[PDB]
Design a protein around this nucleic acid. Structure first.
Length: 213
RNA sequence: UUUUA
């Protein structure tokens, strides 16, 4: 029970990016200080790091970092300084650069923006939400289209009334995945049995359920 | 060495 490339035909290219972006790679034991100097501008620049939720259950030499800043002009200045795939902002775009040239210089850091659009949506009719029928989901790329998560949670076992990514860590969008239903059977059976290998011929990932308590 | 409730 798996499928790929069956995502909605809807696309857009007219809007611009938001104040938040991700910065993957950085396996060189650096901290958020690496991005506070990489994106130093005369305007605002604020760091963003989840701090391992203060639990610090692990401490690998690798990790991933983030930032948020009001320079929409610098967001496009660094997305044109970085390069990999200048494709559509519908999650099809991607960029890369590097932070070393004398040690482990065989890699590049991943650079991915976010758009001015809302992070959650569903194609089904709307219904009221409750914490008793929702979940937070991970094991995914930290970023996916809400209309794609709507189709995956609407096709693999039954229908759904809300899906996508939810906003956190700051006043700007995106942070972690979420989905909500109106029946407990379609609820945990779809989001926990979505072991499928999700693909759109330019991205590959999986999804897993996690309770809020 | 690929993403924050």
């Amino acid at each position: 029970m798996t499928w790929s490339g069956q995502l909605p035909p809807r696309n857009y290219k007219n809007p611009i990016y938001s104040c938040k972006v991700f910065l993957g790679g950085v396996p060189w034991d650096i901290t958020e200080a690496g991005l506070v100097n990489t994106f130093r501008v005369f305007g605002s620049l604020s760091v963003e790091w989840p701090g391992k939720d203060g639990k610090h259950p692990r401490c690998p030499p690798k990790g991933y970092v983030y930032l948020v800043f009001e320079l929409e002009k610098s967001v496009r200045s660094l997305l044109q300084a970085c390069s990999h795939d200048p494709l559509s902002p519908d999650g099809l775009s991607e960029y890369y650069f590097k932070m070393s040239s004398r040690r482990m210089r065989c890699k590049e850091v991943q650079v991915i923006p976010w758009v001015l659009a809302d992070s959650n949506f569903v194609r089904s009719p709307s219904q009221r939400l409750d914490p008793s029928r929702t979940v937070f989901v991970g094991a995914l790329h930290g970023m996916l289209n809400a209309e794609a998560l709507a189709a995956i949670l609407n096709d693999l076992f039954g229908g759904v009334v809300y899906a996508g990514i939810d906003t956190d860590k700051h006043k700007y969008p995106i942070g972690s995945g979420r989905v909500t239903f109106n029946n407990q059977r379609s609820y945990l059976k779809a989001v926990s049995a979505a072991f499928v290998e999700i693909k759109t011929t330019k991205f590959t990932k999986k999804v897993q359920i996690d309770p809020y308590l």
